[PDB]
Design a protein around this ligand. Structure first.
Ligand SMILES: C=C(C)[C@@H]1CCC(C)=C[C@H]1c1c(O)cc(CCCCC)cc1O
Ligand SMILES: C=C(C)[C@@H]1CCC(C)=C[C@H]1c1c(O)cc(CCCCC)cc1O
Lengths: 617, 617
């Protein structure tokens, strides 16, 4: 990409004007103006910009600032005012793919100079110009997405007085409910620029609260937190989706006092010594609405801090009371699945060769009904999550296996109907997958669920890479053993499968090595087996030590948070009912008149904290 | 539960009075008083309270305070004084199950306002009213147990001047030796509200010492630390029972100087450079009394800090000299049990088929006598601990096994008397349990006892959850292997027991997998065995890594403290003698005249500390 400003890199005439404005002498510009009258030219023509981007001369003026001061910018406004052009200069943007839309007010705000932005919009510059280049889009290397607006650029770079001036100027008041070409307003942009660093979280929380208060002062009828982008997300939902937790935590529990009391969510109902009763707001933070923060946290967000967002209140108490409401249906589902797997096990064990036969036919048609029921249920589940199939796959890996087992038992039943003798491996693989999928329902109990999310420390990629190295080793020594044991002076290592088995048996502790005098090269085969044993012993040892050093590092125990996330995913998948009885969901919380006719569907938590009471003591 | 105060939630007329007292304007109340004369009503009637709880208007007055000040509370006292009622208002309580007994003095003290509580009890309010609701009982969610008294509420919320005023007012002096409806006095309540946080421990120690000194000043004849609740526990015993260690540690070793010298327990006998000789008090801190702190720490408390309470003095030296007195009886018991197990082993090994026979009959009747002796001893032990059978089971898990082995050998002897050929598995299981219970007596030696309490890192629940997952795996693949090996083209995996064995043998390193050409689906059975081996290898690896990461975290070594707790449990179970020779216990310590005619059964420790002497240097 071309650089915007470059102190020694080459990109009136063009170079003469660019050098005299890079210095910025206001009298040495004299002699330019009449030169524009003879040729009927303007300052925004393609011969007077950098023809690739379109970076005009005033953009170089606001780029090169003498300590934030430039004496030549208002000369350029006088020249463009009396240059005969219908169109302006300050509204003119670049045209390259990389800096598409990047005006000069963006540079005047970026350089943190109140004087130049004041002298720009006091002399008729636009404040809504969208800098929409690829440099200004997120999730790309060398990028800066600030929200594609001058007010969002002033907000995302901490410049307080430029925000208050841009909202409180008599020339052009910037729309606090404006948008970019992505749909994002300025609070969306503060959410997008946030990280999980503590100081950046403090900066974005500071600018968010201050901008929300100025929205109360300036535009009190509209509500800024209820505006959605082109994906239909409020800034709370955008903070839940893109994984920024600390601004999400700050928005979720927010208490203000006095005139800014209406734009709080954590109203305090009462207190009594150490007990404190708060009334949180469930404005789109519950599963009653279609697209809300619970469904976005569970099924839409792709981030590793996603399991920490169900820890914090009111989401803890909301998910806890939803789970207390639905734990009877969870264990009813588990009992139905246990009955189905008992039918599967008794049908498979008592299977005939290739009254009792009638009862087994009853069992077989019950298996086909249960299989087509689970198959339609899992297909409906994957159709509901059709937008994000990689977010139904990254964590909840049992919804793949329930589908796979149901598909395999339906296919095995139609292979039994179609006479084929290859149905019994499919029915057995279905039975194995069903008894394995029985361990999905261990979430509902506290301690075994905590252990079942604790028993997955060893990373699946960390296993597959070891399987790659071990299969290289086993295959190399397998072809080696068969091609050395091809000749003689039963026969071991006769085929590559039998030698692969006899080399794999060293890993399970059943491997036999001997000085087999049937072979001709018995010393070389014994030395090669010894080399295989030593190499795979070093291999398994290095895997054990490196995996233990990756795990045992005093890292924070996640198992309570991931267990609460798994129960949250389960209760949100369960609240829609089945695929035939689509039930109606409780509007959780009581509707309370709070402040001003603003009635909110509030949900009270009643929490005690002896440490917090004794420090407010 | 209904909220007590709620700033925007709806629960003269009732609403008019409630709003005008929530503001609190004293002149705008005028016009209420005559309205009570015409209808012959009062202020405490059910139409003038919240009819569910009974929250009167003055409770709303003391709830809504203008910075701890309310100008309307004494107007309400004038109205109730001249309202013609026989009964009062300030004594009137709520009547809901949740806030049962919660008067208005409790709110006046809770809001930390000396003015409102002064204007209450200077105008005739009770100070002994028991707030006994379910909100005010402990061990429940959203609860605050402060002791169900106004003085206990002032003490448990750090308010120093309200305590000194409530004890030192000329209107109604609060009884420092009062009680709730549970038996607890105020020092009991300070024990109940304590935690193991350091700052809360400092707060409860500060209020405890100050309240004890004011008990010396106000009520010097009675002793506040000798008052027991309805379970019969002093506050030292309540601190030992409910597990609060730091207030227990502070009460146990307490030194004061000067006029508060009589209410100390750690009197200093002498010092000589680094050696320091102290005279601790054994007022109910020894096993001579029936119910004391040693028997409560060992056999009554249910807490994980229970093993740290035998570390600290004088309990360390007391248990050490008791163990030096009783270690000969401990190893006499161990030698008797070793003789009994040698008789059991020689009788079992030389058992006949289904002089020497007479000697074996002598051995059999010796086994029956030893078995009925151990059975009666363990039944007497479980009858003595009949109140807390879960505290004879949570730590001391050998008293279950001694009972089980004695019961099994008595049952095996009566099955040999009753001719039955099923006696020999019971006698063998008794012999196994007896040789296993021989490892109980390893407590008496220092280093092997420290190792035997060190060799129990792996949690029993952490094993049982792995056993659940592994049994799911083994059962699924067992029915899979038998139903695939049902057909052919000896026979392996013929039954589910034999396949369960041949799959369990992979875990001990003896499992055989081969390309068994007797079977028809030999490739599917080999692939299924390979899948079982890989899955259980990942399973055992995840158990090992997760269990090692749970254990190896630089946690503090408990093994000395739990070894001292095990020796304490042993010496307290041994000091009662056997179930036939119930011996008399030494009153440990010397009776010394200390201060004023207050003779205490003191026990001196003689401890050196080079670090403590050099900082007092
Ligand atoms: C079974 C042996 C002899 C031990 C057993 C335990 C451990 C992990 C070390 C084994 C061992 C190797 O497994 C391999 C070598 C030589 C490395 C070969 C690669 C150049 C030495 C070596 O002591
Ligand atoms: C014996 C093998 C091949 C190694 C030996 C040591 C370690 C713990 C890893 C084993 C192993 C699995 O035990 C399982 C897989 C695949 C996971 C199956 C579940 C999808 C790969 C994988 O390298």
């Amino acid at each position: 990409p071309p650089p915007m400003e470059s102190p020694f890199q080459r990109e009136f005439d063009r170079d003469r004007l660019f050098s005299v404005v890079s210095r910025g002498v206001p009298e040495e510009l004299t002699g330019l103006l009449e030169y524009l009258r003879w040729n009927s030219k303007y300052l925004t023509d393609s011969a007077y910009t950098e023809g690739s981007t379109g970076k005009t001369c005033l953009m170089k003026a606001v780029l090169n600032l003498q300590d934030g001061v430039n004496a030549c910018i208002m000369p350029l406004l006088q020249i463009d005012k009396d240059s005969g052009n219908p169109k302006l200069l300050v509204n003119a943007q670049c045209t390259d793919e990389f800096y598409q839309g990047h005006s000069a007010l963006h540079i005047a705000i970026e350089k943190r100079s109140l004087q130049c932005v004041k002298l720009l919009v006091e002399n008729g510059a636009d404040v809504h110009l969208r800098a929409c280049g690829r440099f200004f889009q997120k999730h790309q290397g060398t990028c800066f997405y600030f929200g594609e607006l001058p007010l969002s650029l002033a907000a995302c770079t901490k410049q307080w007085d430029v925000v208050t001036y841009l909202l409180e100027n008599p020339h052009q008041p910037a729309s606090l409910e404006a948008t970019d070409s992505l749909g994002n307003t300025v609070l969306h942009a503060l959410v997008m620029i946030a990280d999980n660093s503590p100081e950046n979280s403090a900066l974005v929380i500071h600018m968010y609260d201050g901008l929300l208060q100025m929205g109360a002062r300036l535009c009190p009828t509209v509500q800024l937190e209820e505006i959605s982008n082109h994906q239909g997300l409020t800034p709370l939902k955008l903070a839940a989706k893109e994984g920024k937790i600390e601004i999400f935590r700050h928005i979720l529990q927010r208490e203000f006092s006095g005139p800014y009391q209406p734009l709080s969510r954590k109203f305090t109902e009462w207190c009594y010594g150490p007990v404190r009763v708060s009334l949180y707001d469930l404005s789109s933070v519950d599963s009653w609405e279609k697209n809300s923060v619970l469904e976005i946290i569970a099924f839409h967000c792709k981030s590793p801090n996603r399991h920490r967002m169900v820890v914090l209140e009111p989401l803890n108490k909301l998910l806890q009371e939803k789970w207390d409401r639905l734990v009877s249906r969870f264990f009813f589902n588990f009992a139905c699945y246990l009955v189905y797997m008992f039918i599967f096990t008794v049908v498979a064990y008592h299977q005939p060769s290739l009254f009792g036969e009638s009862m087994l036919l009853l069992g077989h048609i019950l298996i086909l009904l249960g299989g087509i029921y689970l198959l339609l249920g899992q297909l409906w589940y994957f159709w509901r999550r059709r937008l994000f199939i990689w977010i139904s796959f990254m964590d909840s890996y049992f919804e793949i296996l329930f589908l796979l087992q149901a598909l395999l038992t339906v296919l095995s039943q139609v292979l039994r109907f179609m006479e084929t003798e290859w149905y019994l491996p499919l029915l057995v693989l279905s039975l194995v997958l069903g008894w394995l999928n029985l361990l999905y329902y261990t979430r509902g109990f506290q301690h075994t669920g905590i252990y079942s999310v604790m028993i997955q420390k060893v990373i699946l990629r960390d296993l597959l890479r070891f399987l790659l190295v071990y299969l290289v080793f086993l295959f190399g020594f397998a072809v080696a053993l068969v091609s050395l044991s091809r000749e003689a002076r039963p026969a071991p290592y006769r085929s590559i499968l039998d030698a692969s088995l006899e080399l794999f048996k060293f890993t399970i502790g059943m491997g036999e090595l001997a000085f087999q005098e049937q072979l001709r090269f018995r010393g070389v085969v014994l030395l090669l087996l010894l080399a295989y044993v030593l190499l795979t012993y070093v291999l398994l040892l290095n895997m054990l030590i490196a995996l233990m050093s990756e795990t045992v590092n005093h890292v924070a125990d996640n198992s309570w948070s991931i267990w609460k996330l798994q129960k949250a995913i389960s209760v949100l998948e369960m609240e829609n009912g089945y695929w035939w009885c689509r039930r109606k969901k409780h509007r959780e919380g009581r509707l309370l008149k709070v402040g001003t006719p603003d009635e909110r569907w509030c949900f009270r938590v009643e929490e005690v904290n002896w440490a917090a009471w004794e420090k407010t003591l």
